[PDB]
Amino acid sequence: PIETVPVKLKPGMDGPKVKQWPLTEEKIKALVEICTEMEKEGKISKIGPENPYNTPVFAIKKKDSTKWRKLVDFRELNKRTQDFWEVQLGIPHPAGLKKKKSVTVLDVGDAYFSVPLDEDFRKYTAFTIPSINNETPGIRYQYNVLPQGWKGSPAIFQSSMTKILEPFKKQNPDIVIYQYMDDLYVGSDLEIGQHRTKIEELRQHLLRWGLTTPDKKGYELHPDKWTVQPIVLPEKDSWTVNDIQKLVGKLNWASQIYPGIKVRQLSKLLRGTKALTEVIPLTEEAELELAENREILKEPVHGVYYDPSKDLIAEIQKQGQGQWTYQIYQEPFKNLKTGKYARMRGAHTNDVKQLTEAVQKITTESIVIWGKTPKFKLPIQKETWETWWTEYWQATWIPEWEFVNTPPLVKLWYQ
């Protein structure tokens, strides 16, 4: 009977009105079955035509063993309710989580289902289960309880979460716990063995207060290695004209980021019109430029800090051999974080799956470091991604994304 926490949209902001993407017959049936039981438990209820709002709904298999889950793209509602979960109720972000050696993630979204939602706000939680070939109008539900995927749900459950976590935070004062959406990030410096046992302690402390947590045992994420990776120049015994050409061009690109790089001595080495395959020995004066530009290329950039008022931007580029690379930034050439994602050797691997897994890997790291997700510039056809991104999505959140139609001129510069 907990009094509903009233939610008000920003003045001048109407509710979300997003279309429902067409789905497989298999996925529609799983949603109808899930929603039928959710309606039976009072979590959701059907609505009439006087509700014009809609939020897209999808189906994933997190456990992947006869386990269909419902995922709602509350991205638009999150933007139009930002003042509620970013100003009125705000979950502060710890900066010590990135310093901890191991950070385990736990799903705690089931706690929101007990808390009711304000009757006046339930209109904006509306979603539609689509019908195949428009044979019938969709099935229209709205949430009566706190909806998972909405950023206002953990902000409302914030006080209840802090109260439940208080005994565990007391016995373990050095463990950092952060709540982003439906997931609890738990960071410590302990040995992996006793870290997992301490995580199992928190899992049982959460359980004895009525908070269910998936017990499928999402490996631990170690953020000590996280850094802006250094740009590496090729290392060869003997050099050719072409290898020095690729070297001069790469350092000219780094001049936009790293100033103080000089290639003129290397440019003097390649002067007369010569064959690319012609092996030109390295002069000592230009060799000094290679060593001077290897040293300055391992120092971090200057004047690169995170801006809380600006959004994060993540660019992924495909390097081949089942490997991808990424750069998180806010202003161009000022990289807050770079890295590379390489899928473990797998015959089942596909380009979309690797990009999907990369986006989830990048978003999680970005959540741990900054407490908010970036907007991805995805190297994929728009309609291709919008069709198959749900097939490998194992996360409860969905980051913003757009699609790049302009190719990268040189892939090797990032790698």
Partner 1 sequence: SPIETVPVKLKPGMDGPKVKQWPLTEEKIKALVEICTEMEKEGKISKIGPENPYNTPVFAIKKSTKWRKLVDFRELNKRTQDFWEVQLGIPHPAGLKKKKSVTVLDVGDAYFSVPLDEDFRKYTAFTIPSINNETPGIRYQYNVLPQGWKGSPAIFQSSMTKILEPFAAQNPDIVICQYMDDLYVGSDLEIGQHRTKIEELRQHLLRWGLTTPDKKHQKEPPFLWMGYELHPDKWTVQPIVLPEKDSWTVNDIQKLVGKLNWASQIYPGIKVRQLSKLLRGTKALTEVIPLTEEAELELAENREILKEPVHGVYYDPSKDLIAEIQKQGQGQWTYQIYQEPFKNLKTGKYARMRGAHTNDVKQLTEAVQKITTESIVIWGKTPKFKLPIQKETWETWWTEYWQATWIPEWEFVNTPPLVKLWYQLEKEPIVGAETFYVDGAANRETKLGKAGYVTNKGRQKVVPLTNTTNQKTELQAIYLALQDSGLEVNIVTDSQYALGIIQAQPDKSESELVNQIIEQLIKKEKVYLAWVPAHKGIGGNEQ
Q: Residues interacting with partner 1, by CB under 8 A?
A: 17, 22-26, 28, 48-52, 54, 132-138, 140, 240, 242, 245-246, 248-249, 252, 263, 267, 270-278, 317-318, 320, 350-352, 354-355, 379-381, 383-385, 387-388, 407-411
Least distance from partner 1 to the Cβ atom of residue 63, Å: 24
Q: How far is the CB of 245 from partner 1 (least distance, A)?
A: 5
Sign of CA dihedral 181, 78, 340, 328: negative
Structure tokens at 239: 């050099």
Binding residue per annotation — 183? yes
Contact of 223 with 214, CB cutoff 8 Å: no
DSSP, collapsed to helix, strand or coil, labels residue 401 as strand
Shortest Cβ distance from residue 384 to partner 1 (Å)? Answer: 5
In the complex, minimum distance from the CB of residue 330 to partner 1, in angstroms, rounded to a whole number: 24
- Closer by beta carbon to partner 1, 159 or else 384: 384
Q: 99 vs 123, which CB is nearer to partner 1?
A: 123
Q: Are 314 and 375 in contact (CB under 8 A)?
A: yes
Q: CA-CA distance, 59 to 10, in Å (whole number)?
A: 30
Is 73 annotated in some ligand binding site? no
Please say whether the beta carbons of 379 and 404 come within 8 A: yes
Complex with partner 1: residue 194 or 381, whichever CB lies closer? 381
Q: Say which residues have a Cβ less than 8 Å from residue 403's Cβ, sequence separation at least 6.
A: 377, 378, 379, 380, 381, 382, 385
Report the nearest approach of partner 1 to the CB of residue 340 (Å). Answer: 16
The nearer residue to partner 1, 191 or 278, going by C-beta atoms, is 278
Question: Quick one: 168 or 392, whose CB is closer to partner 1?
Answer: 392
The least distance separating partner 1 from the CB of residue 230, rounded to whole angstroms, comes to 22
Q: Which amino acid is at 120?
A: D
Judged by beta carbon, residue 216 or residue 274, the one nearer partner 1 is 274
Q: Is residue 182 annotated as involved in ligand binding?
A: yes
For every residue of 249-276, DSSP letters joined together read: HHHHHHTTTS-S---HHHHHHS-S---T
Measure the CA dihedral 238/240/242/243, to 10°: 10
Tokens 């009439």 belong to which residue?
A: 48
Q: Annotated binding site for Mg(2+), which residues?
A: 107, 182-183
Q: Annotated binding site, which residues?
A: 107, 182-183
